[PDB]
Design a protein around this nucleic acid. Structure first.
Ligand code: MG
Ligand code: MG
Ligand code: MG
Ligand code: MG
Ligand code: MG
Ligand code: MG
Ligand code: MG
Ligand code: MG
Ligand code: MG
Ligand code: MG
Ligand code: MG
Ligand code: MG
Ligand code: MG
Ligand code: MG
Ligand code: MG
Ligand code: MG
Lengths: 206, 127, 150, 96, 79, 98
RNA sequence: AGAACCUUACCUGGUCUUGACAUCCACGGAAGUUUUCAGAGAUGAGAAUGUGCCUUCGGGAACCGUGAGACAGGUGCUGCAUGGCUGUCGUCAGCUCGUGUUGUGAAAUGUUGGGUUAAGUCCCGCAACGAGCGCAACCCUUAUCCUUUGUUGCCAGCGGUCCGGCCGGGAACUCAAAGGAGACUGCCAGUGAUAAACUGGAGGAAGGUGGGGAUGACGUCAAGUCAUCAUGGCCCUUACGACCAGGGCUACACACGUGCUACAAUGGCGCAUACAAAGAGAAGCGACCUCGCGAGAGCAAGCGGACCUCAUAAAGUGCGUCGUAGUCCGGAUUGGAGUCUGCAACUCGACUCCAUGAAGUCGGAAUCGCUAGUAAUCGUGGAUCAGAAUGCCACGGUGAAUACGU
RNA sequence: UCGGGCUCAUAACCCGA
RNA sequence: AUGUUU
């Protein structure tokens, strides 16, 4: 692996975590599972909800959470109906009566996972990866972006040999610490294989 | 007056107690030779004093804390020097000339995950 | 390779005052136990006293003069063949060469303690004899016998 | 991993939450010098598939019975992989 | 063997050995616990220690105690 | 008296935390030992990256756990809950016992 | 980063067939409880006991057993179907692209060149003009100084003192640790195109990317991993599925790689003694005192921790000595006796006790590492972890030689 | 002949028996 | 010297 994870070494500066609270060898253990468990069921349903990130905290014997959805409306449904239903899922998969809430995400076409899960589906939707990623994905540039790019995986199309497509605009110097770039992936299970996605969204340096 | 001398280097940290007159030293409830003495050329403590004398002039009673042998006493060296400014903040330009004011920037080296000792690596015969 | 350096000097003699002398204590020093080196390079002269007499300071260098070379050869490949072109060594490494070969034999004496295993060679030079002094002229053999080179 | 194996292990866990959960000492005191018989030590055929030393870990997330971390619960792959995203508070790549 | 104070044994056998010892004898007793310390009561009893395939009928003399049926029974192969 | 051992994976839950924690009970003034820094318990964690062989790689981490002392001396019942009741904290950890 | 069982996939045997793990339909029964017998267990058949949530009373919620299937299960094969991840040259200074232009074209130019730099570093020049990824920065950490905070940390002037930072007390000091100060060819001289840059200087803790981290370009080896996990296809379906007991991965007539310990007096053993850094911990670290030659066992406090336990650093230092002996070296091997971690240590565990004391006297052809707090040597802690580190990760003590030159 | 080394690997070459 | 192997 030449390039490492541009998001990994960023939790320190210019990039926030995803589960800020506290825990020791005792709780940290059960805690690591919790944050996982939830994000699992929550996502599956919040799929069509257009998610960007799922923050998770914990004040005391209860989790906070912050569903970062580009459209929490669907997460509501009959006004409270949908939300409420899931609001119970956590309280049971967390072991304690945890709170809940969200924070809609505008400009979703300029978000890693969001854009990632976007171009990954078009595949099964019968589209031309190239003509798509170089268009219905680079759109972020339009939004006065500073730099962005996406690097697909192998088994592209009906090919029997894995590969990787280029296509990129702006500048994505995944070496500058202050730079800050949004990274994410999505293993869009292709009808005949399992292609991957890699979105690099750099929005301003420091 | 109750002067002060950092004397803190190589994992060590001393406290040069420069008292008025009396060139006697008593580090850690004991004198120079009454401790680390007779093990190394630690007598290098007077080395700095070799530019303006001492004894009745000033005092070099110290007391180091933490660090290794040559480090503790060695720390005082780089400390006593700067610990003489309260007697002449302009005489400092007579200590660094013999390696003193400059803290011993040299320390241990972090062992790198992959090397026997952060520099040397295992052999590779079948290479 | 493409850079140049000066030298790495250190704290000289503990009292007799002698920078280069330190080398005799370092070069001989092993396992980084200089604390013991001073116990051998110093106690050595304290034994040669009655042995020789005159200041142990000179005593050392005295016989040392009959151990330091002044001309060596360095392998240089040319057209397949690697000549042994000679070359007169400057004082800098000269004195060093001696100390190396000197301390070596001393540790090959194969008797009891090094304090004595060291003095022996320290004096064996002047009087001429031992492995140490051997190399001295032994090097001269290869020397000039190749003068047809340099 | 392997669901078939994962479950097989799950059994080795619940048993402790039963027999060892307390009755483990119900015979222990009668095992060490606390006079003292041997009957209990003899008819000792209760902890079979159950033992406080036969439970493995396996990456919580996945299930690899190797490369485990107590402070966490997953194995090198998941842990690192997760930490990268930030599913672990205060876990930046160390570098003194 | 090494069992400080109070050697280990498998009841499974104890309830089979002496259980059949009282009433004379019969056919060889198919053991299985090679990790069991030989009992001085099962003296020359017609048994057989499992070797991972079958059982080998062996007897202990007045000199084997701390040993286990495993000792007097091969479990590998060589030569 | 009442102690308050702090511990968090960042200053966020300490900086603007310990501070208010001090100027809470004593709306005007009071004893209380006061906030303090203290060392830092660090637990370095190293793990192998690439799956199967390649044990020569690895990737190390460290959960920097910060702390603070504080500890109140005079248990002014008029300011006691002025700190306890006012126990917000964005998910930290501050012990309290004597 | 931990194979006695377990793990564990492999084997010999015992045993099962909508399943060990899922959802679901229907039936009976709250779930369960402790025991009995027989079995190696996997189980099988019982003996009593337990009698939860609701019900417009059927029904249902969990759940237990069984019946039946749709299904489920597979560390099974393809790493040339793949994701994700990683090694590799290589921390190399490279790799490109848009526009213009040259050529029929493939391509070229830039990016070449003159200096210069660790560097496609910087300047100069030039049919080139610009730009993207990369080297140089921001991240860490260390070297200084300041700010503040002073408890468990500190102890200087003051007294107290059972003389113990032990009391009060003092916030001075080290220290801790959040915010900063700082280094930038920034300034001086020479050289140099009066270019860049280089070489000396001052000042400074620190000079010319300060030192060490992390960071690994476009890519190549169809490089490695379907066994972490995911997944295209393919394959098994009273089974390549599943459960249990024993065995094996700890074989051996050999060979190689990485290691540990010695062959010794810069040493061994007996005495006393001198000093670090970083981490560890409630099924935890476990002091104290008693007994034990000993491992350790008993008693039991303290600390969830700058409060206690791990913790009693080792080299080093000064003495008794032994005298170059295969020994006062070295410790393999083995016999008998024990401790413990554990259902359980024969197969296959770590330690202790006494007895035994190996080869080995510095190692062929050849071959490796290391440019400084490095090499070298000496100790210390962590991870995994019931209990078996000459391994890995990390910490400091001490502490070199040598570098013309390609 | 065999065992080891040298090379990416053979032979050759070097070492040992 | 060769490698579909002096
Ligand atoms: Mg070191
Ligand atoms: Mg599976
Ligand atoms: Mg285990
Ligand atoms: Mg096994
Ligand atoms: Mg299926
Ligand atoms: Mg491949
Ligand atoms: Mg393969
Ligand atoms: Mg192939
Ligand atoms: Mg550039
Ligand atoms: Mg960089
Ligand atoms: Mg499969
Ligand atoms: Mg093995
Ligand atoms: Mg431990
Ligand atoms: Mg260990
Ligand atoms: Mg041929
Ligand atoms: Mg042929």
């Amino acid at each position: 692996g030449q390039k490492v994870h541009p998001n990994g070494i960023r939790l320190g500066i210019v990039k926030p975590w995803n589960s800020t609270w506290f825990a020791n060898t005792k709780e940290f253990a059960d805690n690591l599972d919790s944050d996982f468990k939830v994000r699992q069921y929550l996502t599956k349903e919040l799929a069509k909800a257009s998610v960007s990130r799922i923050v998770i905290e914990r004040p005391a014997k209860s989790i906070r959470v912050t569903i970062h959805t580009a459209r929490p409306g669907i997460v509501i449904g009959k006004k409270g109906e949908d939300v409420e239903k899931l609001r119970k899922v956590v309280a049971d998969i967390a072991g304690v009566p945890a709170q809940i809430n969200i924070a809609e995400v505008r400009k979703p076409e300029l978000d890693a996972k969001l854009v990632a899960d976007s171009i990954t589906s078009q595949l099964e939707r019968r589209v031309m990866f190239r003509r798509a990623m170089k268009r219905a994905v680079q759109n972020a540039m339009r939004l006065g972006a500073k730099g962005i790019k996406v690097e697909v995986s192998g088994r592209l199309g009906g090919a029997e040999i894995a590969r990787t497509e280029w296509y990129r605009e702006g500048r994505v110097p995944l070496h500058t610490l202050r730079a800050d770039i949004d990274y994410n992936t999505s293993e869009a299970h292709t009808t005949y294989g399992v292609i991957g996605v890699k979105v690099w969204i750099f929005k301003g340096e420091i | 007056n109750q002067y002060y001398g950092t004397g803190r280097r190589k994992s060590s940290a001393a406290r040069v107690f420069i008292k008025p007159g009396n060139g006697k030293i008593v580090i850690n409830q004991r004198s120079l030779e009454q401790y680390f003495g007779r093990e190394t050329a630690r007598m290098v403590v007077r080395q700095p004093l070799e530019l303006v004398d001492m004894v009745e002039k000033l005092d070099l009673y110290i007391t180091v804390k933490g660090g290794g042998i040559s480090g503790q006493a060695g720390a005082i060296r780089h400390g006593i020097t700067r610990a003489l400014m309260e007697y002449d903040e302009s005489l400092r330009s007579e200590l660094r000339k013999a390696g003193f004011v400059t803290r011993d920037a040299r320390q241990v080296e972090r062992k790198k995950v992959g090397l026997r000792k952060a520099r040397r690596r295992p052999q590779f015969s079948k290479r | 390779r493409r850079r140049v350096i000066g030298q790495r000097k250190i704290l000289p003699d503990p009292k007799f005052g002698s920078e280069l002398l330190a080398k005799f204590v370092n070069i001989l020093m092993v396992d980084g136990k200089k604390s013991t080196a001073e116990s051998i390079v110093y106690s050595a002269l304290e034994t040669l006293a009655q042995r020789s007499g005159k200041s142990e300071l000179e005593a050392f260098e005295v016989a040392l003069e009959n151990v330091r070379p002044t001309v060596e050869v360095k392998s240089r490949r040319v057209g397949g063949s690697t000549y042994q072109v000679p070359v007169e060594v400057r004082p800098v490494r000269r004195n060093a060469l001696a100390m190396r070969w000197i301390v070596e034999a001393a540790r090959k004496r194969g008797d009891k303690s090094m304090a004595l295993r060291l003095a022996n060679e320290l004096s064996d030079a002047a009087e001429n004899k031992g492995t140490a002094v051997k190399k001295r002229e032994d090097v001269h053999r290869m020397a000039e016998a190749n003068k047809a080179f340099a | 991993a392997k669901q078939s194996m994962k479950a097989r292990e799950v059994k080795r866990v619940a048993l402790a939450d039963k027999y060892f959960a307390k009755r483990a000492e119900l015979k222990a005191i009668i095992s060490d010098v606390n006079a003292r018989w041997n009957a209990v030590l003899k008819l000792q055929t209760l902890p079979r598939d159950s033992s406080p030393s036969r439970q493995r870990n396996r990456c919580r997330q996945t299930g690899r019975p190797h490369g485990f971390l107590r402070k966490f619960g997953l194995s090198r792959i998941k842990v690192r992989e997760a930490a990268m995203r930030g599913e672990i508070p205060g876990l930046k790549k160390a570098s003194w | 063997r090494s069992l400080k104070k109070g050697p280990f044994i498998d009841l499974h056998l104890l309830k089979k050995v002496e259980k059949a010892v009282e009433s004379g004898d019969k056919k060889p007793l198919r053991t299985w616990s090679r990790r069991s310390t030989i009992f001085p009561n099962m003296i020359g009893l017609t048994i057989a220690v499992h070797n991972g395939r079958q059982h080998v009928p062996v007897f202990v003399t007045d000199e084997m105690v701390g040993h286990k049926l495993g000792e007097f029974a091969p479990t590998r192969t060589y030569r | 008296r009442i102690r308050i051992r702090l511990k968090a994976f960042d200053h966020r839950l300490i900086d603007q935390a310990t501070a208010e924690i001090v100027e809470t009970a004593k709306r005007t003034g009071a004893q209380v030992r006061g906030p303090i820094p203290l060392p830092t318990r660090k637990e370095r964690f190293t793990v192998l990256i690439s799956p199967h062989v390649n044990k020569d790689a690895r990737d190390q981490y460290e959960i920097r756990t910060h702390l603070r002392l504080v500890d109140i001396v005079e248990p002014t019942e008029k300011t006691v809950d002025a700190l306890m009741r006012l126990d917000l904290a964005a998910g930290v950890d501050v012990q309290i016992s004597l």
